[PDB]
Amino acid sequence: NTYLTRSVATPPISVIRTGPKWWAEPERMVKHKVMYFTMGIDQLPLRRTAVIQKDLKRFHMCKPPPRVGDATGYKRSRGAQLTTWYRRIQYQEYHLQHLFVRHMWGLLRMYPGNTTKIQGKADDGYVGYDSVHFHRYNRSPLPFPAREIYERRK
Amino acid sequence: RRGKPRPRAGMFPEKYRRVPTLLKPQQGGQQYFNEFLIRSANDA
Amino acid sequence: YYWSRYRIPSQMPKFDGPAPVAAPQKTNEFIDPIDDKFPVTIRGNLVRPDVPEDQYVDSWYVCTSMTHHLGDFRPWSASAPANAYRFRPYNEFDSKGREYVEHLRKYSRYTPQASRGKGANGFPFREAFLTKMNTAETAAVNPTRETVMTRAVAERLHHARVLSPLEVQRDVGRLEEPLPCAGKIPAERSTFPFRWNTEDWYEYEVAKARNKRFVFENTNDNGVCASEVTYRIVLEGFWDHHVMKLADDVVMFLKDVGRQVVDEKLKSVRASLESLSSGGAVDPELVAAFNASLKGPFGGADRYDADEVAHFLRSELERLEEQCVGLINRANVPIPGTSNIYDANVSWPHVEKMEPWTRMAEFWTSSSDTSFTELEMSTAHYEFRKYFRVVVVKMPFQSTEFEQRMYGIRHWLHRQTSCEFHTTYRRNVVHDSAVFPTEHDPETKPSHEHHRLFSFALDWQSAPVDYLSVELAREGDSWSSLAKRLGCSESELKAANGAMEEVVAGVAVSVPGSATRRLTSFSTTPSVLPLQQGDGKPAITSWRRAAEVLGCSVEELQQANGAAALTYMAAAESGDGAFDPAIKELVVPHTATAASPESSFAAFEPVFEGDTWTSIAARLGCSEADLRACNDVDGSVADVSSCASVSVPASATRPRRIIHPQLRPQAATDALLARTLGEQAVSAMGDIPSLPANAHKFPHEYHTPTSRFPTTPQQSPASDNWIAYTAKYLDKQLALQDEPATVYNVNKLWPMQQVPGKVDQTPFEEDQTWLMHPIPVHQMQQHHPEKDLQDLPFVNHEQFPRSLEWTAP
Amino acid sequence: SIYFNLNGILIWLNVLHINIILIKYAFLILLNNLEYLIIFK
Amino acid sequence: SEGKAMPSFANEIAAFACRMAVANAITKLLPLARIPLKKAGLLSVDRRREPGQFPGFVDGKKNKRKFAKR
Amino acid sequence: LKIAKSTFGFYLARRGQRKFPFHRRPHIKNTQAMNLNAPYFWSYMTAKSQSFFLPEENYITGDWTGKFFVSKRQVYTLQHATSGGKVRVKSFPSVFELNSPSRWNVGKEMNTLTKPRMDLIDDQMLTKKQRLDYVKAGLLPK
Amino acid sequence: MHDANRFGGRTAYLREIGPIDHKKKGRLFKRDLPTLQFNVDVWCAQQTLRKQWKGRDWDVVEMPFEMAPKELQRVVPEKYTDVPIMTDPARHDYMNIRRKVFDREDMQDALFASGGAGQSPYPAIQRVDKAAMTLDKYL
Amino acid sequence: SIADRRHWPAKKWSIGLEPRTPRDWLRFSYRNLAYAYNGALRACATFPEMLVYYKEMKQRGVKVDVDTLNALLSRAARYEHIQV
Amino acid sequence: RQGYLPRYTPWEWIAIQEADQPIIHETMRTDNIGASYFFSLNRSWRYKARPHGYLRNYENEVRDMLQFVDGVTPWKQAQKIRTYWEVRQHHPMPQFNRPEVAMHRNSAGLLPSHMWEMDKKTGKVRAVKDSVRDYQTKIPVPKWVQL
Amino acid sequence: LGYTPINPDTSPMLMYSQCHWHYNLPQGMERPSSVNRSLPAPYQPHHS
Amino acid sequence: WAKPKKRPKVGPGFHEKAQKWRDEYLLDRHRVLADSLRAYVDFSSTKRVEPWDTRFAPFDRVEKDGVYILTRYLMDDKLQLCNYHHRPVKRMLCNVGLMGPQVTTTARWKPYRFATNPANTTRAERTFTKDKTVFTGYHHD
RNA sequence: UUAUUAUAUUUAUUCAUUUAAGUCAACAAUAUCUAUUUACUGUUUUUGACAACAUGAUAAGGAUUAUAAAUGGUAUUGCAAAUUUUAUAAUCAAAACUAAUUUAUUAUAUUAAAUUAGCAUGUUUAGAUAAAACAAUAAAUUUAGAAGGUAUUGUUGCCCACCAUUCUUUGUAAUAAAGACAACGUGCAGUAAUUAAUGUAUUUAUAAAAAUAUAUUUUUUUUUUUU
């Protein structure tokens, strides 16, 4: 990972909401596709998410279905449970993409950015070459140079 | 600055009022209608 | 009164009425109350009558549209021929469809001639020509094994014809409408599509942008753009419809004067030809000029009879007629019914459009101090504009009576419309070799040392080079002996100096114009004036007798003799101990010195490997019998690489000069810099340092203006390539110190021709070398020699508002 | 001095507007700010 | 590329301009191919326009400046 | 201006926090004249080449009765530091002189010598309002 | 913006790291765009200039006209000064002359007339036999 | 200046109405006129009047259609006084 | 009064306007002699061929400038103009490398350590002594300078 | 509308008022001015 | 208009506080100069921490192998002479050209002020606590 | 909440700059019939546009009139046309912040030429807060159509009591009553008005008044003709 400077986190929905802007950026989901593909891992959630966006992108132009008065509200309820499902589908995938990649860097030995956790290789947050005295969250004064978690040889 | 609250969505003009009515929604795949009417005429 | 005009002449309408129906009873008055409530389904979405847009002129200060026709409206019918599909001039294609079919038809006729002389128009279709340039992919991929199969199975096996999509009867009703008449066009890889080469595509698009001006229209052709002089008039009015209606006017003006004026010459031309109509009866002078040539067309020295001369003349008037009458015809075509000025083939002259000039002038409409957002948010863009139309008149001959009809157009132009004329007239120019001689190189080739700054000021006497035309016959020279030293023909010398029938030693012969051995009118080797006897035994002791002895100015004597000038009269402090030269031997001013055929011409001409004895004399111009004799004949040219040039023969030679004659001599620059060359010998300025001592240790902070980045390091001793390096450091025993490079020069720095002998640097191939070298970044403000006048990108000063595509002829 | 019939005169002095009409669509819409702004039509 | 020439056309806002340019092209070549195209909108042209430059907006497109109350 | 600090307050308006183009800020406020970056001590706010000739203000064109102060673009030389005579540079409030000469000043223009924004501020020059604003700032506390 | 992984890292020339005091710290030229923009135009031009000069498989070598290749035995108009000159239309050889490269082994005649044992510059070209049987011909 | 401003009336023909503005050329084509006529032919009661349309649609090149064949030929048989 | 405004300026007013203003004698453009390469561009200082534009154009004039600045100026007076490095030769640290390239090249030998004083505890420069009095340099004005 | 007078040669509101042409009208030449050729004056210079 | 209201006089006798203050400040200007100049120079003579980032290839390879070989043998004395500043070494290392173009593209390097730490800078607290008395533009140490 | 149509909707935030006065009128030199005109001399009485007061005048600002080519306003923003009656204040080179009305560049590569910015490293982290619906892509948690004002360019509108001088005046009840009136302080009582008001009765009290009990509308409306 060539990006190592400090970062800023945004909640899943606040990124999922951007849709084809960054979340469903065509080439991005092609990236995490191949990465999933090559690892022998089935790309089920991505293709599960891919159809979600592809339909939303295709139909982002139209009006919402005419809100005729329904005292039952089943249509408004179905309009919500089907939505929160879609969010929950992307919620899993959004986390899933961050799950493998940090673990993937455990296999390529690429030091992720600051305040980043790889499940086994960097159990707590790794921070090297920051702009501050200490580990930003654990208040541990950094070691110089940036501490290394992998073994030196390739 | 506004300094007043944000207006609702309906009072704002239509978000895509410029795209032609033909495109929302895009009736894609007109190619297939002639294929589907045939197979449907087949079974019927 | 200056105001008596501004009163009103009639009685204005009077106020006796109520408020019109439903108007003021918030409500913005501008919107018609009832008319706008009229449903669009019934009246449409139109605001101004549905007529061809060009009628409307964008109004000023009154936010609406107004017709340049005074309230009249021409329907769409007038904008097209009879019954035109979609109201087009031609039924076949739209704007774009007629834009690109033009080229595809224009490339079908492109031949290397069509480009030369013509500017951007001469360029072929950018695509049809660039893909042709790509014969890499051009290899015509035959229809794949599958296609020829899927068809063969279709055409024969399944008993079914296969049809191409154009020929497919997509019709549901009219399956008897034929395929397009070209259903069998051949598809190749070269022509279509246009997949072209990248770097070449640059070279085309760039060369197109620069060669816009290089149109040579004054030709001798017979075509819609053949002419002797091409005047272009660029009218300039603030309103489009102004300039158009004007560009229409001058046409029906120049069509009148142009038709008449050219007609009189046509009345003259047919007069200058016929059976008992002579006028081209050749001048005895003209029939001489055709026969004023030493060597003509067919055998030796030539002679034309007056007849074929009178034929050559008629051989040309036939063209000045065909170009004349071809003009009158294109003058009479445009009628008020079918006036089309914008086509050269139909109308004469033919107005050519030109992009209007537009200068957006945005500014803060507000004016207040506390709030800046108030200002910026209050920006409003009002534009200045000027519309141009260019009238292109092509006269097959330059009549000054017509031109002075033209330069009088500026008077009666329509209001607020200035015009500029672009005259383009052929002009006969004499390249007389007598003044500019195509002679050999100077023996001492000038170098970059002669092209620093201010070299034009101090290094070159402005061309043409001065040459002596006056030569004094020496003590016993003859006519062949003078023609010798002047390298000219004795007969030419006899003709040159009419008054000189007998040569009297001491009179100056007028050097012939055709001479080849004339001198640079000055002497190069410095001369000194000793206080040796001179005038009597008494020597020079004052400024005036200093001039009297040399016979030149006291001033020009001071200019070269700077040190002697700063001290005294004739440098009164004479020589003691060791003779004081500038005092004793005053350097004669370069101007007071006369050249010599010895010093002027190098008497040493080199020899090359392919040279033979006569071959060198063939280059030098002399004879072998003159060369070999003057050179103490050798068994072979191999020994001496520089055989001395022949002591000039009687007829001529082409010998190299000792030094470039145009080069401004240093002695003159000594004269120009008199005082400063004085204050060297005066105060004994040994030497002045330019940089402090330790500079070579400190590489950067001493970066003089003439110095440039990226700095060229010291060259590795001979590491020109890998063998040069390997043989030098890794494998000393290797035989090939350097692989055999080209015997001819190898300029790796292409195409930037760099000064020779200078340790030079090849552009960095690997990025790592590009970033790490010390290169400054543009911290301070940006400056450029040309557009520093146009101070910023925002404020673009225009001394004159001209169309941004205004091409100076 | 040429002329062609009027449609509405509009004396827009700084005091007020007085917009008379004799309706048509339009042609050239004249303008004078000698002292009193008027929009001839 | 008749319009403002750019290095890379890798954006749909350009692709549609090409998708339309090819659509109109087929129709001129083949008459009755206009029926299945027009019913699917490939012939129809967008009137969408990215906002032209303007100094008032800080970025220049649609976001105004700041103003704080006293 | 709200507070006319000189004759040019009555005329020109602040126009808000207007953003002039780079290097075209109208008033030549060299408040960054003396910002000592020791490595670039010979290149900062100096002649970009060290083979230029000295500016004009270090020299005397003609027979002068006498300059009240020599301009601030003048560069300091050893002759300046050794002759020791009163050398004056214009600044607020009245004028500044180099009474205590040194050789650490030789070679740098007077721009880099003087301190434009004198840290000691005037509770006298600023009305009760403009002083109050310094009190809140902590530059002139209370 | 100036995230150091932008512009091939050369953005490090334009970056004021940390909580800068906008008034006193931070170089001026790093603020105005066109200077930042003009600078990137420099570096971005270098990569082109680099790549154009990394593909210099050919080396420029002058040659008297008489023994030059028969391709350039005609008038050769300078670049950017005429419509690109296809080499030979009649010979069906439509390749830009500025783009046609001639092989050093082809021209050891004049360029290395000093070759002595003419191979000593370089051995001759082994041209492939495009006619006799080979795997391409199923044989 | 007189010959221009003549607006030769669009109703030069039957049901097919001529265009005279560029926006009107958008809603017009010699192909689609067959639709208008086949809509009128099938509205004609008797064969004889169905001539004046076909007789016309042959004058200006309004290309016929399949249903144009039906509308004529179907009623060609049903017109009693027809000769075969 | 009746709208008949001329679409074209009538032929009459053409002649009447075109005869009120005189022909420029120069636009006649007649030349059968040729161009005078030696003399034409060197004509008298009144009507001379006046160069204009970029400084390159002033060939025959720059030469006069040099001849002029050579004339009035005595070298005596011009001697006093000092280059910057001529002045910086008197500074305690006249020449030391800047960080871009030769930062490592700088050494303590470049330090004028004797000018100031160091304190061992702080490791810094506590003050500096007076350099104007004790700077005895044989070249207050440089060597080749001779008033 | 002030002390600074309006330049009558460059103002549209003047030049395109009714007391002069409008930019729409045929814009031809109003009247040919034969001054120098009907009553010409002779050349009495002040510079000798 | 907020009609431009005058500022009062500069105060009585402040000029004397001016000629004084500017002068003896310009005297302080010397010592901060003399201090920082030494700090800059003596920084240039010292050793730095190695500019490369060991985390990224080709500097993850063990000291025995990899580009550390050429670092240890072909140029070892040189890289000590250049005092391991991040400007010369990346220029020296690019000259040897035996690692190709992997200086800029592959090999990632420490940030600027992380590479001006002198040798034996163990505690990371150090790189931010460089002295404030010196005015150097963070070249000092 | 009445029977062609959507707000819930990200992307941002530490920003400053100004100097050292000078208007009381016009004057061909070349090539057209000659003027020294060459070097055309005649001595001096006023106070607006200013450093000051001195009428007009165009902007910023979104909130309910497009389906077949348009998202920025008039009430007014420094220098403008009739009010003068202390006064030179204008850009020139080298020059000093206190200012509401502002994108500053955040860690592969970093000062080349009119002089141009060295301390603020600390979890893109307080409270406040900024701006989009336009060639792009978010189309719904939902809309005309009934309603009041003590104000009277109208809520930043008025009003109200206690709390001081006063003054006036008495039928002298804590600490006289009434009327006048403009301070300060305390709320914020009233205009359906922040728990509707009014009235009457009981009680309560910084003060407008509050709680309880009844009428009541000078309060605004919500409306089943035997399920």
Coordinates of C-alpha atoms in Angstrom, one line a residue, chain C residues 114 117 376 400 529 572 591 603 640 650 691 700 705 715 729 772 781:
Chain C
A114 CA -2.9 20.0 -54.5
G117 CA 1.3 26.7 -52.5
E376 CA -18.0 38.5 -6.4
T400 CA -3.6 51.1 -60.1
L529 CA 52.9 54.2 -38.8
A572 CA 53.8 63.7 -27.4
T591 CA 39.3 52.4 -42.8
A603 CA 46.2 30.7 -51.5
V640 CA 50.3 17.1 -49.9
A650 CA 43.6 35.5 -66.6
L691 CA 33.2 34.7 -9.8
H700 CA 24.9 26.1 -7.0
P705 CA 22.0 34.6 -15.7
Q715 CA 31.8 14.1 -18.7
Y729 CA 37.3 -0.3 -16.3
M772 CA 16.6 13.8 -8.5
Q781 CA 5.6 35.1 -11.1

